[PDB]
Symmetry: C7
Subunit: 256 residues, 7 copies
């Protein structure tokens, strides 16, 4: 009945091990952190290393009480698969949680459509990205769902491009409408005039004739450029005599 | 025939074990609860620890009646996978059930669209969140389905932003419509006048000309701000002589 | 050739076991039923316990005829996976079959939209819920498909809320339309007048001007409240002189 | 070279076994069929029992020719997984193939929408249900796809309910339209007058004013009740002087 | 160095086996083909039987050169799983490839909608069905995608049913329109007059009043029956004085 | 310390094996290529055979340095599953990559809709098919995505069929419109007049009466046949006096 | 107590191995890089080879401290499956990351629609492709999502093709509209006149008669060709007297 030495051989080896465990991780990601591989690639890889050691420890600590050793791998591994399954979801969120910090297709502050919802990005935490619609809402999207989808990024390209489609009446001057516009974009300062600058007759529409105007600006400029150019095209087409035709329709009339 | 000692060696070890089991969990999450790691990360992890011990116990208790030990891992593990499979669904709901309490992208009482349905959030219980449409319905969404999807949060940002689009007739004053509006938002007290405050000519529409007005308010204020500002723009555009044009259409007439 | 003792050692152990089997379940869920854990958590867990015992029994009963024991785990476990696979579907239905009875987000008799189809709920049996559209159809939805989806519940909130949107002509009295309405909801008895009670100018519409009216009632009351309030707003807007404008359209006329 | 006794030890044991196999199934579902558990739960469970015995047989019959026994479990089990995979689809169809005969949410002859396609059902065979659109087409739906989806059942509720929405002109009599209708449903014999019977002003529509009429009938009656009640409401609204208004539209006229 | 007897012990056993292999399949589906179970259930099951024998053979042929036997099951089984995975797709197509020949919900030549695309079917080969839109296109649908989906079958029901919806003006004769139609279907020979034959007032429409006419015909007849009956209803409604009303609309006129 | 013979026993067996490996594949698909089974069924099957031999080799080469042999199956097999997983995607593309060359539902040059995108098919390489929209775009579709979906094939049927729907006014000649058309298709040479050739009154439309014309042509002919037949029906309906009615609408007029 | 030789036997073998490891990879992809198989097929395959060697090393290094060896395969392999699972996502992105450098269906700079979003492609890095909408946005699409989907490629075909649909009035000259157009495309220099060049009467439309014009150009030319040809067809149809008819509608008039 000092076969209950085993009982202390357990608590010997459990704590002999738990302590040689926790220090081989602090010394695994001692190396990793200084190799500067990553912050949470360290914590994932090293707390794994730490963990397979507590794993080995439990086996010899149990074996020296009399536990089959082939059923330690069983119970552990299986009940490991429990913890796995449950946190399997979030573990995938952490993949893109690191994958979003490096590469950063979008970086904090940019405006991005991703997964259909679009806003300015506050922070990419470990599981989720937080953003703000220019509306004043907080949208929080799972990192996984983000990296699976198209990341549309409005900011990281410094030169964006406007597109006006404008309608005139069918009997308007095909050339005057081109020249008033050409001169309207020539007289704007926030329009890059080395880049694309097209104004042409695009569509023989339903009730109208549609001219398209494409003019690249600075990123920050772009929003205001449109509003200022439209402010004008309304007056300078009115003053010039051109009509923005109301929906036109020919009626063929019959008294029955 | 005292080989039926085994039969009592079972009930010895089954109950020797069941009792050393149930107390190593109460002592595992004794540590976890005081390390304050979580409420149900304790109950999940510790009732696992408790459980792999009843698992080991069944093996030696059976082995000392004469059960193959390699078919205890079989039956158990397999019939474990039964219990797993069946409750595998809800186990994932509990993931986000803890994952929603920490982080809380939305906290109790906020208004949120998540998974398309939108309401004010009562409680995030273990499997499901409960909410109330401002309509007076109870919607209960599975925690899993929530954490997989975009969490849109209207409340946690304290400053929200309205957007009026208003139409005038084509021959209205391009500047007066800007100034009446500019003065309408200047005279509102619940409008933050340090933040964005744009009023411009946005769209050369079908039958109308459309001015957009964007003015940030307080979160709670926002709903009423719109209703009060629209109450005005209707009168102050009427009194000013501006027409909100009915759908306009040119008819080209022919007696056949 | 009394090596066919084995043959009776089988039928000994098969029936020695089948009987020690069926009584350890009746005694497992003897405990479970009295611990009152559940009705079918008993039947699932206990008929599992009963079953792993018939499982062990088959192994020693075969082994004492001369069956490899490692191919009993094979055949059984594998042909177990057959039965599993086939009934794996319904086993998930039974998850939500118990999961619906406890929690009951919706209880028998309530009106609920769930999975898009909506009705009053008769019974939640083990696999499926049965409901009745207020139309007079029986819809039976799998319990699984239910618990995966939004459960929208109209009844369990005792106070519901109506929403009228009403149109007037553009030259109607912005204040009279507010006061006739305000007085129409003041004079209804089934309207909770402590709760929300808004009437405002909501939309500068196409051919009309739209006032929204939001008034909370009792759950049972709500359906009739609308019908009775609309009955009135039609007359009291007619008698008052206000026109519910037919679709308005300006024609600009030209002889060609 | 009478080590080719083994060769006959195989054909001994293969056929010794194949025959003790096929008779333990006929005697397994001898019990099952008389316990009346089911027709094809017998054939599935028993032809499994029969089968794990041909499985054991192959192992000892091969082992006594000199086949590794651990590679019989391999080949068999694996090549079992072949047969499984291939027929895994249909095996799930057979789940709902039995699951549709018991419970029968819909029974032969009823009219049901399920999976969107809707018809009258004649037979639920082992894999598939066959139905007839009231059109005269045969639609055959896989049993699996059925049990996964909403089963909408029109027949098993004996009392169904019609819903008329009818429009009048804006200047019609709000009360007369209620009384003509009330009297039209009072004078129909196939209308249950103890059940719901509402006639009210439901919608202040575009060009019309819409009254809703809800009246429960017998299941078989319901189709004809509508046709007969509409036959009337057309005449009794014509004779009464009420107009079913053609699409109304106000034109504001301008010579340009 | 006659330990390279092993080397010939391999080629002995490899070819001793390959030949006892290929003849136990020819003799397995000798039995199966004559039990007439199927054509390709033979080829699938028997070429499996043939195959697990080449499988056993490789193990003893390798073992007698000195290959671990537990790594033959490894390599084979695993590299088996390669072949499996790759052809796993088509193996499922062959399931429904046999599953379509038996049962044949649709048989060669019938017109069927299945998976949305619809045509006349001329062959169900092993993996795929081929069809012809009545347009003159060849559509080839994977057998798998077919058996998963609703099989809509127009031909196998010999009596199909037409449905005319026809509009008259609001002031047409409610009874005459019923009698002209009733007499139009009475005078057609290809209309089964024992079966359903309804003509009633179905819809109080927008600009018209709509009568529905339902008359069952022979399968082959049905296409022409409609074209011939419509040919008539156009003239016999014209000759009778009934107007098929052009879209009606009331204009309420105002000089502004 | 000539226990480093082992070290050369490795490089002995690694290269003894690598060479007996690479030549049993060249001799496996020596047989396969001459059995002409396929080009890449050879390369897949044979480079598998070659590979399980390098696999066996590594085990004995390692074992004779002192590697556990049960952890060679581990590392290999597992790190095999790495390579598998990564290239598992493309391996499925190669399935249909061979599966499209045999059967070829579409062969190079045909016009096909498959997966919704439609064009003329250049080449079916190992992973992907390349096509050209008649537009002048290159669309490259994964072979997998192709074989999973409906393959619609316009070319392989040599006789295609046009369908004109044409409208006349309500008071047009029901018979003349049939005879002008009948004679228009009688006078075309590229119309097969033995095949289907229907011209009938199909739809009592909104503002028009619609005649359908169905006439089968040669595949290549079909595109031009329509254009040439429509060229005519426009004139021969104009010359005949028949009107293609502009959208008709009855106005019921009221001075308010 | 020089049984802690083992402890140094570990650090012997761990570092004896780690170093024979890291150099057999540098020497595996020494061969691979010079066989020029690929850049990252080297890094994937070789860092695998390097890795299964650190894997073997850990087993003998642990075994000579006293670790079960069968639980090294367990812990490693299992905790391997951790790392696998987490990076399993991106590993599939790297598949198409190499798969989109070879083959390159689209090469850097081309304009492509893929996965619905369309732009000019900057770079195909290891996980993701980056592109620029001609708008001025950066869209970054996961390589996986790309190779799964249709790659539509506008550039790699050097000859693209325009398509004009133009409407005239019903009483326009069927031949003149053909000849003005024919001459408009005859007089353009950037139109390949050897390739397709069709101008025909395509659609007998609602309010108009629609002529289609198909003319192939150079890739770069195509955008401008349309704009220049439409510029003309507007004037040369105006000057010729042809009317682009406003939406036509016959009114049948009635005083009520």
């Amino acid at each position: 009945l000092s076969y209950a030495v085993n009982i202390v051989a357990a608590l010997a080896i459990i704590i002999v091990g738990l302590i040689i465990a926790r220090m081989i991780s602090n010394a695994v990601n001692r190396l990793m952190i200084s190799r500067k591989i990553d912050a949470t690639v360290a914590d994932f890889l090293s707390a794994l290393v730490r963990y397979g050691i507590i794993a080995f420890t439990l086996i010899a600590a149990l074996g020296r009480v009399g536990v089959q050793t082939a059923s330690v791998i069983a119970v552990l591994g299986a009940a490991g698969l429990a913890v796995g399954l449950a946190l399997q979801g979030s573990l995938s969120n952490l993949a893109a949680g690191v994958l979003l910090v490096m590469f950063r297709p979008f970086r904090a502050g940019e405006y991005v459509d991703l997964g259909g919802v679009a806003g300015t990005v506050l922070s990419v935490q470990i599981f989720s990205t937080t953003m703000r619609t220019a509306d004043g809402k907080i949208i929080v999207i799972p990192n996984g769902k983000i990296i699976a989808g198209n990341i549309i990024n409005f900011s990281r390209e410094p030169v964006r491009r406007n597109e006006f489609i404008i309608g005139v009446a069918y009997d308007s001057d095909i050339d005057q409408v081109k020249q008033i516009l050409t001169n309207i974009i020539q007289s704007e300062d926030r329009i890059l005039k080395d880049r694309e600058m097209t104004v042409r007759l695009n569509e023989l529409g339903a009730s109208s004739i549609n001219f398209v105007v494409r003019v690249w600006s600075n990123s920050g400029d772009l929003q205001n450029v449109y509003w200022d150019v439209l402010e004008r095209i309304k007056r300078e087409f009115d003053a010039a005599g051109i009509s923005f035709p109301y929906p036109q329709m020919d009626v063929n009339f019959k008294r029955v």
